[PDB]
Amino acid sequence: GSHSMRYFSTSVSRPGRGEPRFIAVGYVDDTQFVRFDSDAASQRMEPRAPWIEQEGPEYWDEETGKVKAHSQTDRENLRIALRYYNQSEAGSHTLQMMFGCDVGSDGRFLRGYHQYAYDGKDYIALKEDLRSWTAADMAAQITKRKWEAAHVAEQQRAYLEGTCVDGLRRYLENGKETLQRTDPPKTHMTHHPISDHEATLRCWALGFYPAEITLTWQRDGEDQTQDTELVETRPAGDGTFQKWAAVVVPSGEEQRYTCHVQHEGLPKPLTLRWE
Amino acid sequence: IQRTPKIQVYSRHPAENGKSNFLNCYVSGFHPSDIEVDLLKNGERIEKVEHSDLSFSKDWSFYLLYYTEFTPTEKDEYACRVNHVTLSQPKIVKWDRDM
Amino acid sequence: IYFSPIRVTF
Ligand SMILES: [Mg+2]
Structure with a gap:
């Protein structure tokens, strides 16, 4: 520490x-x-x-x-x-x-x-x-x-x-x-359709302290980095941070994907599934 | 020589139409430090827009946070307009409550 | 705590 x-x-x-x-x-x-x-x-x-x-x-x-x-x-x-x-x-x-x-x-x-x-x-x-x-x-x-x-x-x-x-x-x-x-991240998940063919799965971390966080996507329990949009840790303005990881998913495949959050306010890494 | 700002327009708390929040425009990785950030409401400059004191990270690149209060409405539109020596013209980034 | 003056330039 x-x-x-x-x-x-x-x-x-x-x-x-x-x-x-x-x-x-x-x-x-x-x-x-x-x-x-x-x-x-x-x-x-x-x-x-x-x-x-x-x-x-x-x-x-x-x-x-x-x-x-x-x-x-x-x-x-x-x-x-x-x-x-x-x-x-x-x-x-x-x-x-x-x-x-x-x-x-x-x-x-x-x-x-x-x-x-x-x-x-x-x-x-x-x-x-x-x-x-x-x-x-x-x-x-x-x-x-x-x-x-x-x-x-x-x-x-x-x-x-x-x-x-x-x-x-x-x-x-x-x-x-x-x-x-140690402020733990408030996690949530959003789902936006790109087309009737595919969709964006966004996964957020909000209100956390310190700024050290890790956000990782997994398609069928195997790490994805091919189509992952990961923004830079940004200050929320209240002395806490924000971050998100988006992923391009074909229509219906959403239940194959999981978002993984690693923060020092979390005892065990949170897993996130849609919905 | 010089690097371009990487712009981010977002809110403090999750957006809810009718509740007061904070509109944020975070800029970073730019060089030199002279940067003009403007927060807009329906294409018009918001007056009394506060900003953080100029800082940089271990890799020497600058970062700034411009912010103001705002009450999101489905009716009204928000964005930040950024200027730097690395841009031939001002860069407009709209605010999506979803990114 | 800021460092005390370094009275040596480049
Ligand atoms: Mg400690």
Whole structure:
């Protein structure tokens, strides 16, 4: 029963139109708890979940300070990648970052992240051992080189194995009621005729937490993947997820097919038959 | 270089004609992040359409959820109109209570 | 808990 904390940062340049907008969001497993936006009136880290509001006012001052510092670094990081890649002064570019950690059911350190992507492709990344970096290309190698000399991994190793896991532990403790909960999927089945020759059999999973789900069709107890339409897990908007798997079935063959749901709120995988 | 959004128009709770719900338009796998999402009622733009804060997944691709309240009726029609640099023109996806 | 400043650029 693992748990994770992640921070997703984006810095999108807009040349001639002021400084780049920086957004940052924090997530504890599939729930968002924080937000910061450089293009916002407040200019502060703001809560996005009930349980983070129980943090003292000093938290909000320190968090605002830390996110503000990174935003500044990322605007110069955008200007450096631009000269590194011999790219024109014209044109919008994106620098994204992901950092955070993974913990055990007991709270032990499992894994730690700290990585960037420039214009949607990997730039630099801290390796699993947290001592070394992966440089995607040549520009990133210049950074690899700069960061090795500057003991950046050493510092992030301490953040990742220390601050991160501890901070996660208290978010899990404070956010017990909503995070440690497991919402089972409410299943149902729909049937829509394509023609008098065939029909679509849709099978839904609604209101579930976390987003890890598995939906699989079977024709006569043998796994189907030939004519299966499987949409991406989508948020319902209330902090729960939705998913469905459709299948093309000839008229009358509907009783040969079964939908199979695997969720960590389900003791045994639910089987679904029409009707 | 760039990726196209994968659009999904659906509701929070199952649709029932006459009950208040939430109309959702989830967009993902796109690049860059600048995207224009509009929720429509009978082809007209709904005003005061809230959206999630810009996030991405482990594979660096963005995702957003635009949403508003709505009371479904057999009479009225819903859809979301999406714009991105990867589309020569706005993409319209109608709302089917069945998908 | 956001990471403390890294005062090292690209
Ligand atoms: Mg647990």
